[PDB]
């Protein structure tokens, strides 16, 4: 169905425009010089609060993506017709976005990306 394809395209355009704004909120409070000492998230309250707000945002993105992926699978299972080159929901994002990368997206929504690890995990 073209409908779920449209929803995934709209969701992915919205996600790629919000993600750098969300990461920049963490950088403002959590970034520091690479000095071999504790990351700011270990004890700086405005950094810890920024991480909590990013975690709320990315958790919501993961839940939305899970809903849309299941709708994609339900649609592919109920319809016979195919869309060329489209096997997964990632192929819709790859086809419509500029330099969408599946591993980067999967890492971001699972808090395994460099920004969340380097800014929000204490070490």
């Amino acid at each position, epitope marked *: 169905e073209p409908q779920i394809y449209r929803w995934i395209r709209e969701w992915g355009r919205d996600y790629v425009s919000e993600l750098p704004t969300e990461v920049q909120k963490l950088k403002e409070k959590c970034d520091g010089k690479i000095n071999y000492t504790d990351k700011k998230v270990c004890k700086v309250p405005p950094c810890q609060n920024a991480c909590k707000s990013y975690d709320q945002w990315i958790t919501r993105k993961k839940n939305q993506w899970d809903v849309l992926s299941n709708k994609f699978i339900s649609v592919k299972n109920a319809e016979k017709v195919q869309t060329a080159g489209i096997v997964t929901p990632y192929d819709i994002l790859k086809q419509e976005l500029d330099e969408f990368n599946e*591993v980067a997206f999967e890492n971001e929504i699972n808090k*395994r990306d*460099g920004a969340y690890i380097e800014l929000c995990v204490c070490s």
Partner: antibody, heavy 118, light 108 residues
Framework: EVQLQESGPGLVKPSETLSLTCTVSGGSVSSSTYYWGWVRQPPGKGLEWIGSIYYSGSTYYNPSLKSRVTISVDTSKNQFSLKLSSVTAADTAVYYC??????????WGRGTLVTVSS | DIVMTQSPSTLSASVGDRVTITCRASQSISSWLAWYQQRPGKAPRLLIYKASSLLSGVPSRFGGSGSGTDFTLTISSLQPDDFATYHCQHYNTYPWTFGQGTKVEIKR
């Protein structure tokens, strides 16, 4: 399309330092999601991850090399680099630069053979 | 560190055969395992990540399975361009380490 391009000498004398650079083209080294890494494959042997770096400058190194390896990043030149000191012929290998998705290396350079010889 | 051990070291199969490569971890790595293919004169390419997720753009004949310590890469229908060395790699914790590689040769 993002491409990784290695550069640096193919011949290094024993005891000197091997230096290689990876230039990102069609994309940016200033990725808030990815790390950037180096992997090597000595002739007729297995792959060995050397280390990875985040665009902030944070690094992770294989303990097999941590006492003689330095990985750097230059976001103003869209590049990252490797320096391996005190090389021996055991360091002769194909060296690859790679985009490191926190363990899943999803894009690799073509590789550069570096021979350690006098 | 974690040691990854692949088997067999080499295998020969005909076009259309089902090929299986195993990878065993010295300790549990959950599903943090990747499979790479290295075709002649080329740098490796990622085929599978998270033990069973097929990367977009990679042929559907590649599949990954397993969890904990035992993993398998299966090529459901071997093709001539599958002549390559296949490598497993864990990413459970640093350092990332690879198996020794498996060479797949074609019979004709």
């Amino acid at each position: 399309e993002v491409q990784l391009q290695e550069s640096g000498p193919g011949l290094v004398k024993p005891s000197e330092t091997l230096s290689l650079t990876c230039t990102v083209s069609g994309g940016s080294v200033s990725s808030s999601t990815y790390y950037w890494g180096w992997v090597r494959q000595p002739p007729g042997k297995g792959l060995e991850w050397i280390g990875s770096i985040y665009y902030s400058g944070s690094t992770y190194y294989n303990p097999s090399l941590k006492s003689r390896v330095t990985i750097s990043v230059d976001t103003s030149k869209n590049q990252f680099s490797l320096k391996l000191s005190s090389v021996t012929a055991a360091d002769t290998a194909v060296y690859y630069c790679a985009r490191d998705g926190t363990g899943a290396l999803d894009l690799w350079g073509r590789g550069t053979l570096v021979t350690v010889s006098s | 560190d974690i040691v990854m051990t692949q088997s067999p070291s080499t295998l020969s199969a005909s076009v259309g055969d089902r090929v299986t490569i195993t990878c065993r971890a010295s300790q549990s790595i959950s599903s943090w395992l990747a499979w790479y293919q290295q075709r002649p004169g080329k740098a490796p390419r990622l085929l599978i990540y998270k033990a069973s997720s097929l990367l977009s753009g990679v042929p559907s004949r590649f599949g990954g399975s397993g969890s904990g310590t035992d993993f398998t890469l299966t090529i459901s229908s071997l093709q001539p361009d599958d002549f390559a060395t296949y490598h497993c790699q864990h990413y459970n914790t640093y350092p990332w380490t690879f198996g020794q590689g498996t060479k797949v040769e074609i019979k004709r």
